[PDB]
Symmetry: D2
Subunit: 288 residues, 4 copies
């Protein structure tokens, strides 16, 4: 059965680079792409900004439809086609299936799950092919939905709480950040539990809690934060703050507290927070 391969990925995820190699190595496969049909009908040059329109979309969609049938209905030489779009819209994916079922073709996916941080990196250097940051956030939000990743929706019965980070949030570089520290105390009065988190490694190979202890002491004897729990990146862990903090949240926090907010300063972490369903306020420029 001739196959139709939908590439599932955010812009900048490796889609096209892979399609080009696959076609180079496997005779009988052809690429179909909407970005290409979008630039061609306007005869746009590499650096022109395409103006979105329902009309133009219907046309490109039509072009994909017709180009698929025509190629798949080619001789026995034809093995399949690659639809190298983002394919991040469920409705769009279903259509390819129904369309494939009536003519007798099968559908396969080829996923390109790339970490948010890397996607941002690439897109900022993508130049003219760059995509706005918010449509990127949205694309990734859809990718997570495709993978079936978790979205927090609260913890019924458990005490409400606010999450505070240390570096850049409660501490500056350490001295206290007056308004944020005053906030944690403000929330405490209001009856909320104060959970503290930090991406600082706990300690060294020989003293595995050196930094943790220092952090705890600082929070207690300088900031005076009435916290109930403190969590930190374990010693030895070299993964991204991104991954580290989320792992800590599902394993040590979500099951014990009804978190209604998170206070942080580092964009990637802030991005992780909103992304998983936790309101987050960014208290300072944290593009690093």
């Amino acid at each position: 059965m001739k196959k139709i391969i939908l590439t599932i990925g955010c812009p900048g995820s490796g889609k096209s680079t892979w399609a080009r190699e696959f076609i180079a190595k496997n005779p009988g496969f052809y690429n179909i792409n909407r970005d290409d049909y979008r630039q061609s009908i306007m005869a746009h040059e590499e650096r022109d900004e395409y103006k979105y329109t329902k009309k133009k979309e219907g046309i490109v969609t039509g072009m994909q439809f017709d180009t698929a049938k025509s190629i798949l209905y080619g001789g026995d030489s034809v093995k399949g086609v690659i639809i190298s779009d983002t394919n991040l819209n469920p409705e769009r994916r279903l259509a390819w299936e129904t369309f494939a079922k009536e003519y007798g073709w099968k559908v396969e996916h080829k996923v390109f799950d790339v970490p948010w941080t890397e996607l941002v990196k690439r897109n900022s250097k993508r130049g003219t092919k760059a995509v706005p940051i918010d449509v990127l956030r949205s694309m990734y939000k859809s990718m997570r939905e495709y993978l079936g990743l978790p979205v927090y929706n609260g913890t019924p019965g458990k005490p409400k709480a606010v999450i505070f980070d240390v570096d850049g949030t409660l501490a500056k570089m350490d001295v206290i950040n007056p308004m944020v520290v005053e906030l944690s105390k403000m929330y405490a009065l209001m009856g909320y539990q104060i959970v503290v988190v930090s991406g600082r490694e706990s300690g060294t190979k020989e003293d595995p809690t050196k930094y943790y202890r220092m952090t705890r002491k600082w929070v207690e004897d300088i900031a005076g934060v009435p916290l109930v729990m403190q969590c930190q990146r374990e010693q030895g862990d070299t993964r991204k703050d991104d991954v580290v903090k989320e792992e800590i949240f599902w394993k040590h926090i979500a099951p014990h507290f009804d978190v209604k907010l998170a206070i942080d300063d580092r964009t990637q972490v802030v991005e992780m927070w909103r992304r998983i369903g936790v309101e987050c306020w960014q208290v300072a420029s944290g593009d690093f």
Copy 2:
């Protein structure tokens, strides 16, 4: 007297485009640039990421120095040279002056003040020449210092206050944003004055306060914000929220309140806030 023209501008401000035209129109002028000397000593290709180093910088600085003397010491045909770097570091600018004073040359500046918003726009499409967002923020911070633009440092004797925006901050799209509304009341108890601001146009040409009135009512009868002042973009004003809110701050707020914080959601406005010396917490994704 032969002149040395320093272009003052952030990356993406028009520096090079102007230098190329000026040289094309004025015989006897030559360009000197560090980005160029930086890529050349490494024989880098358009898409390689340059690795910063003191050594490599000393070399490029040396190259600028020597290339300046050699060209300016050319015949009578030579009129001057353009130093098309950002030139946003005061120390760096002084050096060119002292250097120019000993050989008998004069220094002129050619400023390229472009709005933050536009600088971001261009840099995100700059592709490989793109610069990290934080070094851009920093460059612009220096540009503002060069222009002598105002930086807020408080208001002694006046009552402390927090600034809250409406769209996206207190209101969602309208329904209340629970945590942020709860915050304004929380600060009020703490003794702070609550100043409300909005980029929403006050009204229409025929009803110049239509939206203002609606906003006031909403803040009063739905959010229940104990505000003391509300300010909004005047009817007819079509400038950027960027400019609008800052104008409102210096004219109607800074002189009446000791503002210690601002709550907003739109990145450009948040960026304006921190930029002028006002702590600001971004309560939601606002890349628009």
Copy 3:
């Protein structure tokens, strides 16, 4: 009646640049191009060399066909489509007509006649989109056929002759070029008439035959060429040798001699010769 506009031109003739502007200025027009469909089905990157194939061509042709019907069968908003290919193959052009006649559309052409010399120039700088020189010669040969330009096929009854140029051919820079001079005499014995031509301007504004006289004398008293006719670019004429020599051929030579060969050294002139039906031998490197 909705129109289909075929752009007639060699690669590098301005086709696409015009299509982009036309579409920008005229709402309801869309571009259709085979180069675009060719790079897309292979998911090729700007710098990949496309491998020609009947299969791949049938597919792109199919894509043009289907994309035309689908767009032209759009609402009343649709005004037409531009087929921005070279369209230099008569058979190909007919197809568009027959195809247009059955669905009720009309066909218009938009010619981009650019001089060979300029086409070469652009193509050598076209980089990756560059086309081999021989396919370019061929494209231009078809363009000339489209315009109905003249192709020489002899002159019955008139005496046979060979055409010799002076600069670079008979003369070097002047001293004689031994073999070529020996040739003209060799042909004379064989019974051929020797016609001499030169792109050298005849003279100056005040002495309109200064150079002609000098050339005649040189050919007579140094080379010893038994010529019957000498023709030169008139004084004041600043057009390309290209145009100049061909004008001279049809007006002063073709009607008086049965030319069976031309001896020249400058590539553009040599190219003109073969192009119009006259065998030509290039006696030296003349890329200038």
Copy 4:
């Protein structure tokens, strides 16, 4: 002793690509290039055509001089510099040596000998960095001089002769090419020896002279060429006509005849001919 590495090569030979890798792998090495200094002083954009000038050259030369001293006079960290220009001008190369001798540095060369055919290929796709074809011919002529390759200057005492190729020259595709065949006979009368050469493989693995015999017969019984010698690419040889014919010339022709001319049609072969000192007339378009 700190070294100065001059890269010797024609444009498009791999110079820069190598310099970038070498510097990437060897800490303490820096690149110096005139193309880079040429585009920088004019602040030119990738696609601008640089206007040559003595003034601008003196400046770039000065920049190379000063940049060399300054870097080589750096700490002990500095190992050397790469001068990635063509370096094909002997005078220019000497200067680097004398310059290197007074400051105590040594000079090394890194040759990039690439075949003419490949150099043309690359340059035609080089786009904006492309170089005119004649300056390329000239560069390669200098490269050959650097390598010490042979240039023919005649054969005293031996009988004069003309060299004729078969495919495209004497034969068309075979039928006779009337004027060229008539020429060989014309030269024979004049007392010249007619040497025939062909790039056609002599035969097959099982019949190693199949094609040679066919060619000989054709030349004898159809063209009627009064030849004295016929030479052909041996059976099995898969090298370029380029190399094949030159090998045949020095081994089987130059020592037996005083060749004063060569008649061919294929550009690369014609290019080889003039290049080694043999007048050559190109009788037809042979860009293949």
